[PDB]
């Protein structure tokens, strides 16, 4: 039942949320030092970004636990936006910490941030350019050029450009989602960076050796595929027993009529709908000489990912069972087929009844390249897919944030008051976030951040200093692109998420 | 006293002390609140939502402390928000800045046989021409700027910008279908919560509003005999998955019989109970849910207290867990039950409508409940407020728009009046102010600044401050001529209650 | 351990004051109410010298002896013992002062003997005899009233006390035991102190609002079995054998049925009408459906009205005690002209009243039912107790420290014998009768020799039994104000004084017995 009260709680409050920015300052573009967090439990814990290590702290602050949310709230809807608010929340809360000493503590505090958060959004969609299929680009130029913006802004090579028509392709097919969780990504090692492959279905990565299993079929045109959650092994059902002798005859049987019933148990699916078997777990020796006894295809250890999102692309179910099942459980496609693609198993799937899942499959020939772009993949695709649900697409690397708080320091000089300290700190936030991606760009922020300032009282179009050019100038012409939406939506969080707290500094707890 | 032994949290310095500081500081939270205020403060009892209030009954909920009178006084201050919503935000910080104020004349060497009588002489001064300061009323309920007004102090002063639509939601609300005859609900029109939406799609949907599922059907009439129960389907007895495989083959089916074959007879007496809607303060299970749809009962898949409580209340129902074939003690209350899709969400809509027992009920529709309910407090204590039973609520000048106008009566009593008591009395014409410094701090400025100006309009009655710049520099919002108005009820209350928790608490040496 | 000759008397004196000091701000008017959070564990109020001693968990042991002396007074008084532990350390002060000067405590305690005598002598000499008079008794009630409360809720208090002491004197009783009866009600206010020519009455029903208005009673008061029980027990409890047990539980139900239905045969009996009722009431519950068999005949049946009750019940209403329903006369019971089962608070509370030969005329004290209504429940039986005595007696003395300044001053003029060996007692004794005049007078700001020499020569000069104002602090006239002191009070108090004031003055040494 514990409070502090006034000033020493609120400033106390933005430290604990800012810590944790002062991590992300630049995670997006990640250069900086990443230290491999090991929890408590022993898990090893890092982040292609802030949030999932910000999903790994907790804290007792409601305060560092909100910003947390917000970033949160922005996070998992772009599946971005989290260090931009990170920072900018934080940032504005950093920044009123001396203010709040002057005192910004009057309710005054809450006002000139949403205030003048809207004279951003003002600006954004009056900025903001929409993207179409005959406009510029095919929007699949866009989705193109959009993930030559995402997949290319980290590197990697030309593929980046190859890729950015590629990874297009499941988007088109699945694009509803802002987010691949139907789409997926298949890692091929094998084969070579200039090839890579996209199936109309999911496609699985390896499907397991066991006995028989070059005698199981790797190939159907007519797939009903029993989808696995669970496994079928010689340890599923025993193959230990034992009977009274007076007679030998029986050591056959006591172990047969166990045998019959592994056989009973995958034939039961087999024998009713079933040809592919697809279990995310083990199939063992016994088990799977019955799926070799059956040669209706057997699978165990597989891709659940892949399972499930097979369960998407086919139209049957995940199966808790292999029996008590019907024929409808199965997934279906118009084609299982395996063919190896290094030491991968790889099976088709493809002529889905639905085919839910559409998955792009990257294949590097090598590790490094791939991982470079399959997290260039998730940027194209948080892009990509959002370039196609906005349409409207500003431009990042402060483009409107060296243009924004261009304006808001101009817009300093009406406000003055109390507030207009919060116009100065409201401004620079926006100019705070490529603060770093100067450094990424291997630039001086401020110079470079007043050159832009100068820039934007000579541009001020989309001029900003892009990390994607190491360069400062107009983000948009310089494949910048990203949808203004997130922008309100990020400017929403900007000025709000810092307010909330800044509202309290009497903050009670509880052990109850 | 001079013993190694005996009793007491207070006496002597402390009484004079600590029964009066401490009492005073519950008042930051009040110093803060009441009327305009983006000021809040997160109270967490820990719930896994971190609870933004200015509302002082919640805040004081958690604060537990050593001081019998702020041990006590949170009573009166509590006894408060039952009689009124609004204007317990007020009551905290009033008497508490008006305690020191006798503790200086104790610093004097004003007894406490002295000073509090003044005040409650003027307590009495106040709750004499209190009523002569009232302007208007709040007559027909069913209007909305006649209810919202009232609202619109009392969202207002526990809560600012979010007021203006709530005022309107909750005279949309019509609390007034609810004649006000004597007649007001809490729990016939409800606070229904929705995760989405907005707050101004926050809506009121009449009837029972519950965002539980329901399930299968809808209810076979909508005078329904309302099955609510705790556990009318837990499941009977529950099929198993043995090897990480199946168990076998053989074992499935006897517990499927043993479900099916008395959620038969449940269900079947569920039907046989008479029940057109199957409350579940439990699961279900899909064979009673198959069930509940062939016997023709309106399932809810899950229940929260929230729905079982009102249940109980409102059907005069009684949440119950069956196994077995049911019977309804339950029966209906409602004339209606509905699968409404309300916050846009699919929901359980109980309904009807009357003057009496009638469930007329707010939807809320928020991200959160932090959202949903401080807010909802923000918005209750209006609906708080709405409840006078006397339907003319005597809408005072809002806003403490009343302060200076009581300010310079009591001031001027006390000086009519000699003895210690004058000054008490001019001590009770002191305290008005708080409020609006309590404005003025979240907006930003002494009161001096502004009750000065304000003692400058002198007999005024509309300007009193805020959460504005019109409270910061202008000292002025008119809160009489407003919109934002507020009941004589209250008046008499806080006033006089504060005064009753200050009466004895310097008495109390022991 | 052992603490010697001054040592344990400075324990003596030590401890005293602090009692007393809670009395300087606990006195009267003048004085203030106690909460105490601390001294039983309670969350409490009072005003009262001998109640905020109980009321406190005591760890001294000169305390341990405070709390059981001033007991018996307050239960005839009610007041004094806000006074009585004045007197008493404000003679331990001066019998320290002349063992300070050097002294035996048994040549002290020799001189309050004829001090002791002459002034409860001059009890007689002053004794004043009011005729005793609702409006003097009135007075006599609010000044105790008064001392432990408002005198606007004092003479809330007032009535109540001056309704029942009337109403006692009604069945002859000088002092009072019945219509002593306080009874707190749930409400928002504690303001409303009324008076129940008849009971208050606990449950109406668990079927509540049977007939709800009784307006001619027939009263049965009953600790029969309308609930004998319907639940599941074998020989009374759950025997070895479980389907020995319900064989007999519906013969329970039954043997209500036979009650039930001898109502129906009683009620008809009795009543034949609901417009005279017939008044169930059971010391043990009610079954519903007895309630319902019965309450939609126009019957009213009670449960769970207290042994108290039923006493009362069968007292104040010239009711019965029967414990067989069976068939009985309206005669057969008592009659009360007002039964109406009231709901204020949570619980409805039946008002058996108008009761014919009432033995019980309750008195309604409306409230939160919190260590407030407590508060104002205390002190009117307090006043009551005052009262009592102003019953008892036929003599009250003036309140407001008159009587010392007639009475002290006198012994202050002349030692009773006029010479030294009871000046050494008479000093003591003599100084600290003079304390409550002198205290709550300078509690009010207004200094003691300044205040007691009016109110000492205003006696002298005029002979007048002469007050303090207690608020004010001021020489007043108490014998015209209606603070007033009962002859039944004040006489104890001395005596209270006296009795403990001796030993453990005549106590040196002080050792841990085991």
């Known amino acids: 039942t514990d409070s502090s009260q006034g000033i020493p709680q609120l400033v106390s409050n933005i430290s604990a949320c800012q810590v944790i920015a002062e991590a992300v300052r630049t995670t997006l573009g990640p250069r900086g030092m990443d230290k491999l967090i090991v929890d408590g439990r022993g898990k090893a814990t890092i982040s292609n ?347 990042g690397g402060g483009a409107i944030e060296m243009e924004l708080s261009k304006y808001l320091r101009d817009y300093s000089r009406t406000i003055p008051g109390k507030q207009q300290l919060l116009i100065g700190a409201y401004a620079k936030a926006l100019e705070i976030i490529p603060r770093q991606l100067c450094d990424n760009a291997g630039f001086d922020a401020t110079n470079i951040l007043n050159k832009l300032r100068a820039r934007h009282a000579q541009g001020g179009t989309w001029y900003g200093v892009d990390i994607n050019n190491e360069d400062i100038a107009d983000n948009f012409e310089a494949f910048v692109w990203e949808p203004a939406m997130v922008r309100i939506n990020a400017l929403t969080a900007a000025s709000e998420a810092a307010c909330l707290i800044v509202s309290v500094d009497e903050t009670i707890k509880n052990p109850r | 006293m001079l013993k190694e032994g005996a009793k007491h949290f207070s006496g002597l310095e402390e009484a004079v002390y600590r029964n009066i500081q401490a009492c005073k500081e519950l008042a930051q939270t009040t110093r803060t609140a009441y009327g305009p205020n983006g000021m809040n403060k997160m109270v967490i009892n820990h719930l896994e939502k971190l609870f933004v209030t200015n509302d002082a009954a919640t805040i004081l909920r958690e604060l537990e402390v050593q001081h019998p009178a702020a041990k006590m006084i949170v009573m009166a201050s509590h006894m408060q928000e039952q009689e009124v919503g609004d204007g317990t935000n007020f009551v905290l910080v009033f008497a508490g800045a008006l305690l020191e104020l006798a503790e200086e004349l104790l610093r004097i060497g004003l007894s406490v046989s002295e000073v509090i009588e003044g005040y409650e002489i003027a307590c009495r001064k106040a709750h004499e021409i209190l009523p002569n300061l009232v302007c208007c009323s709040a007559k027909n309920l069913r209007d909305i700027d006649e209810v919202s007004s009232l609202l619109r102090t009392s969202i207002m002063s526990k809560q600012y910008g979010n007021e203006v639509f709530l005022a309107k939601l909750i005279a949309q609300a019509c609390v007034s279908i609810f004649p006000d005859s004597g007649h007001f609900n809490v729990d016939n029109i409800r606070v229904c919560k929705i995760l989405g939406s907005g707050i101004s799609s926050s809506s009121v949907l009449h009837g029972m509003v519950f965002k539980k599922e329901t399930e299968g059907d809808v209810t076979s009439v909508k005078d329904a005999k309302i099955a609510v129960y705790s556990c009318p389907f837990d499941g009977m007895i529950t099929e198993t998955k043995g090897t990480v495989l199946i168990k076998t083959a053989e074992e499935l089916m006897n517990f499927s019989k043993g479900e099916e074959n008395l959620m038969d007879a449940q269900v079947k007496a569920i039907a046989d109970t008479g029940a057109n809607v199957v409350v579940t303060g439990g699961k279900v299970a899909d064979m009673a849910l198959h069930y509940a749809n062939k016997y023709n009962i309106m399932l809810v898949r899950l229940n929260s207290k929230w729905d079982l409580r009102r249940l109980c209340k409102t059907v005069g129902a009684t949440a119950l867990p069956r196994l077995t074939p049911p019977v309804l003690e339950e029966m209906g209350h409602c004339d209606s039950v509905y699968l409404s899709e309300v916050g846009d969400t699919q929901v359980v809509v109980f309904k009807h409508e009357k003057e009496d027992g009638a469930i007329s009920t707010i939807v809320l529709r928020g991200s959160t409940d932090n959202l949903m309910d401080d807010i909802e407090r923000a918005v209750d204590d209006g609906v708080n407020t709405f409840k006078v039973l006397t339907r003319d609520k005597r809408l005072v000048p809002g806003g403490g728009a009343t302060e200076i106008e009581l300010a310079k009566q009591i001031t001027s009593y006390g000086e009519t009046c000699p003895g210690l008591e004058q000054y008490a009395i001019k001590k009770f014409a002191e305290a008005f102010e708080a409020i609006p410094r309590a404005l003025a701090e979240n907006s930003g400025v002494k009161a001096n600044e502004v009750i000065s100006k304000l003692y400058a309009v002198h007999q005024e009655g509309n300007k009193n401050v805020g959460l504005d710049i019109e409270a910061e520099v202008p000292a002025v919002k008119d809160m009489l001529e407003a919109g934002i108005l507020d009941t004589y009820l209250g008046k008499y209350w806080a006033i006089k209650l504060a005064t009753n928790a200050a009466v004895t608490v310097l008495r109390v040496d022991q | ?400 420290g008159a009587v010392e300044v007639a009475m002290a001053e006198a012994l202050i003029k002349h030692k009773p014998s006029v010479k030294g060996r009871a000046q050494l007692g008479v000093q003591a004794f003599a100084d600290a009768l003079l304390i409550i005049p002198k205290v709550l007078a300078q509690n009010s700001g207004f200094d003691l020799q300044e205040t007691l020499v009016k109110i000492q020569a205003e006696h002298s000069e005029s002979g007048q039994l002469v007050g303090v104002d207690l608020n004010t602090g001021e020489p007043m006239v108490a014998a015209e104000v209606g603070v007033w002191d009962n002859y039944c009070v004040k006489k104890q108090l001395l005596h209270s004084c006296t009795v403990i004031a001796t030993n453990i003055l005549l106590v040196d040494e002080i050792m841990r017995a085991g």
């Open chain 1, 49 to 395: 970004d802030g949030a999932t290590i910000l999903k790994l702290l907790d804290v007792v602050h409601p305060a560092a636990k909100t910003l947390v949310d917000i970033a949160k709230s922005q996070d998992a809807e772009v599946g971005d936006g989290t260090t931009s608010v990170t920072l900018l929340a934080a940032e504005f809360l950093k920044q009123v910490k001396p203010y709040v000493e002057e005192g910004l503590h009057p309710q005054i505090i809450i006002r000139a941030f949403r205030t003048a958060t809207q004279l951003a959004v003002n600006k954004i969609k009056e900025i903001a350019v929409t993207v179409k299929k005959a406009d510029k680009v095919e929007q699949r130029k866009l989705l193109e050029k959009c993930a030559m913006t995402a997949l290319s802004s980290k590197l990697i090579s030309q593929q980046k450009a190859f890729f950015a028509k590629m990874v297009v392709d499941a988007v088109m097919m699945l694009d509803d989602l802002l987010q691949l969780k139907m789409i997926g990504i298949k890692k091929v090692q094998g084969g070579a960076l200039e090839d890579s492959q996209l199936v109309a279905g999911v496609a699985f990565k390896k499907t397991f050796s066991y006995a028989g299993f070059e005698m199981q079929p790797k190939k159907y045109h007519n797939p009903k595929i029993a989808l696995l959650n669970v496994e079928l092994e010689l340890k599923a059902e025993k193959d230990n027993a034992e009977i009274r002798v007076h007679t030998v005859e029986d050591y056959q049987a006591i172990v047969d009529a166990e045998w019959n019933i592994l056989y009973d148990k995958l034939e039961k699916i087999h024998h009713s709908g079933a040809k592919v078997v697809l279990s995310k777990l083990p199939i063992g020796d016994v088990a799977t000489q019955y799926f070799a006894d059956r040669d209706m295809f057997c699978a165990g250890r597989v891709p659940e990912e892949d399972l499930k999102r097979t369960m998407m692309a086919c139209g049957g179910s995940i199966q808790t069972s292999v029996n008590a099942l019907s024929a409808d459980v199965l997934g279906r496609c118009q084609v299982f087929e395996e063919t190896q693609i290094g030491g991968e198993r790889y099976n088709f799937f493809t002529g889905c009844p639905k085919a839910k899942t559409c998955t792009f499959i990257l294949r590097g020939g090598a590790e490094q390249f791939m991982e470079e772009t399959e997290r260039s993949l998730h940027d194209a695709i948080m892009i990509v897919r959002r370039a196609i649900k906005n349409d409207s697409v500003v431009a």
């Open chain 3, 1 to 400: 351990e052992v603490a010697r000759a001054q040592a344990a008397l400075a324990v003596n004196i030590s401890a005293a004051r602090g009692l007393q000091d809670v009395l300087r701000t606990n006195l009267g008017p003048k004085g203030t109410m106690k909460m105490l959070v601390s001294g039983a564990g309670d969350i409490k109020l009072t005003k009262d010298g001998n109640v905020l001693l109980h009321e406190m968990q005591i760890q001294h042991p000169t305390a341990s002896l405070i709390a059981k002396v001033a007991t018996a007074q307050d239960d005839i008084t009610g007041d004094g013992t806000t006074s009585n532990v004045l007197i008493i350390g404000e003679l331990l002060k001066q019998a320290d002062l002349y063992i300070s000067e050097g002294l035996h405590p048994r040549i002290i305690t020799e001189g309050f003997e004829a001090a002791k005598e002459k002034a409860l002598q001059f009890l007689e000499e002053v004794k004043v005899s009011r005729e005793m008079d609702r409006e003097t008794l009135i007075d006599v009630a609010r000044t105790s009233l008064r001392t432990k409360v408002h005198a606007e809720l004092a003479d809330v208090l007032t009535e109540a006390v001056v309704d029942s002491i009337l109403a006692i004197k009604k069945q002859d009783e000088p002092i009072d035991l019945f219509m002593i009866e306080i009874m707190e009600m749930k409400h928002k206010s504690e303001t409303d102190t009324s008076l129940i020519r008849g009971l208050v009455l606990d449950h109406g029903a668990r079927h509540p609002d049977m007939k709800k208005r009784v307006e001619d009673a027939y009263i049965l008061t009953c600790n029969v079995s309308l609930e004998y029980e319907k639940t599941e027990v074998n020989s009374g409890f759950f025997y070895k054998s479980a389907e020995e047990r319900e064989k007999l539980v519906k013969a329970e139900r039954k043997f209500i049925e036979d009650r039930v239905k001898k109502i129906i045969e009683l009620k008809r009996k009795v009543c034949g009408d609901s417009d005279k009722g017939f008044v169930v009431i059971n010391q043990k519950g009610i079954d519903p459906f007895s309630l319902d068999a019965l309450s939609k005949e126009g019957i009213v049946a009670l449960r769970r009205a207290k042994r108290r009750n039923m006493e009362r019940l069968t007292l104040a209403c010239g009711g019965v005690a029967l414990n067989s329903f069976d068939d009985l006369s309206p005669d057969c019971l008592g009659h009360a002209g007002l039964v109406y089962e009231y709901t204020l608070g949570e619980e409805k509370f039946t008002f058996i009243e108008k009761c014919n030969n009432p033995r019980s005329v309750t008195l309604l004290i409306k409230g939160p039912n919190k260590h407030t209504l407590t508060q104002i429940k205390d002190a009117v039986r307090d006043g009551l107790r005052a009262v009592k005595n102003a019953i008892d007696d036929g003599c009250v003395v003036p309140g407001a």
